[PDB]
Amino acid sequence: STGSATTTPIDSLDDAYITPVQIGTPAQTLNLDFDTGSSDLWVFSSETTASEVDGQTIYTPSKSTTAKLLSGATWSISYGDGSSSSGDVYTDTVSVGGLTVTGQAVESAKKVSSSFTEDSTIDGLLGLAFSTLNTVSPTQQKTFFDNAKASLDSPVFTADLGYHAPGTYNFGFIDTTAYTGSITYTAVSTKQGFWEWTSTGYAVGSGTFKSTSIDGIADTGTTLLYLPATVVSAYWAQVSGAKSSSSVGGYVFPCSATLPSFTFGVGSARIVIPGDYIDFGPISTGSSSCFGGIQSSAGIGINIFGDVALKAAFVVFNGATTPTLGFASK
Numbered sequence: 051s052t053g054s055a056t057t058t059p060i061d062s063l064d065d066a067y068i069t070p071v072q073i074g075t076p077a078q079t080l081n082l083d084f085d086t087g088s089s090d091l092w093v094f095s096s097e098t099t100a101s102e103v104d105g106q107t108i109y110t111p112s113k114s115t116t117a118k119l120l121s122g123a124t125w126s127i128s129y130g131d132g133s134s135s136s137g138d139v140y141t142d143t144v145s146v147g148g149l150t151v152t153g154q155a156v157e158s159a160k161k162v163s164s165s166f167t168e169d170s171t172i173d174g175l176l177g178l179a180f181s182t183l184n185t186v187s188p189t190q191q192k193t194f195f196d197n198a199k200a201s202l203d204s205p206v207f208t209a210d211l212g213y214h215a216p217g218t219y220n221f222g223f224i225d226t227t228a229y230t231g232s233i234t235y236t237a238v239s240t241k242q243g244f245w246e247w248t249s250t251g252y253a254v255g256s257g258t259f260k261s262t263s264i265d266g267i268a269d270t271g272t273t274l275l276y277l278p279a280t281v282v283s284a285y286w287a288q289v290s291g292a293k294s295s296s297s298v299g300g301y302v303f304p305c306s307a308t309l310p311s312f313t314f315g316v317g318s319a320r321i322v323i324p325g326d327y328i329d330f331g332p333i334s335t336g337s338s339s340c341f342g343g344i345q346s347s348a349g350i351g352i353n354i355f356g357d358v359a360l361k362a363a364f365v366v367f368n369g370a371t372t373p374t375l376g377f378a379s380k
Contacts, residue, residue, distance in 0.1 A: 053149025074114030085271030105170030266353030
């Protein structure tokens with residue numbers, strides 16, 4: 051089997067991407083944030099505290115003939131940005147782009163934090179990191195990808211995120227028309243439960259490439275690119291007027307600037323992030339100070355190749371017995 055679904059930016063800044071997912075029988079379609087940095091599939095639901103729902107589409111398990119309460123199971127998750135959610139668990143049929151998993155754990159939110167409530171476009175998350183990070187207790191549950199694996203033609207999924215445009219998540223096959231040149235594969239450590247890999251270095255604009263190992267994670271659920279302070283300083287030093295602002299919470303730059311590109315290494319290959327991808331617009335409505343798309347990972351404790359980086363590439367998440375990551379230009 052295979053699946054193919056279009057993923058769409060939630061806003062004009064590509065702050066996140068939503069992908070339609072069918073849950074239950076008859077289908078209830080919710081728009082989920084596919085997140086390679088976590089491992090819970092959770093949804094706004096008929097059980098979610100009413101004051102915490104603001105425009106989202108909810109899953110109602112009582113209207114699904116295939117829903118079953120997973121008795122005694124609860125879940126609770128906290129993300130790197132300080133957001134959180136928790137609830138109980140059903141199993142139900144879940145389909146993504148034509149690919150169906152029966153008996154998928156669907157984590158029903160009883161509580162969500164304010165940032166989820168305030169985002170009317172995101173009806174939940176579909177985690178695609180390794181199942182060892184799944185938060186269901188007392189019986190840990192598998193991700194959609196882990197459950198689908200045995201049925202998939204090939205044990206892979208691919209992320210092809212658009213810049214200010216729709217893109218695609220594919221399951222079970224590699225679309226050879228979706229990228230240019232070759233795919234370069236690189237080793238993954240699953241020790242922390244992430245798609246963790248090591249970049250071979252970076253360049254700023256037309257500058258010389260610096261060979262240096264940068265460990266980090268491929269995370270579709272993180273908007274920006276978070277890298278060591280040395281790297282980030284080297285980047286923003288090339289933008290007149292750029293500075294790190296503690297009041298704003300990162301690097302800002304004059305909205306009048308044209309940003310340089312940023313290149314990252316994948317083995318001997320190179321992925322170029324165009325300057326425009328790094329512009330996240332005014333810090334507040336009407337401001338001439340713009341928020342940078344490359345930020346320091348200092349104090350996060352991990353480097354994160356988020357959407358800013360991933361959208362510049364066609365990315366293969368290879369879930370074979372020894373997992374790997376592939377990157378191609380496109």
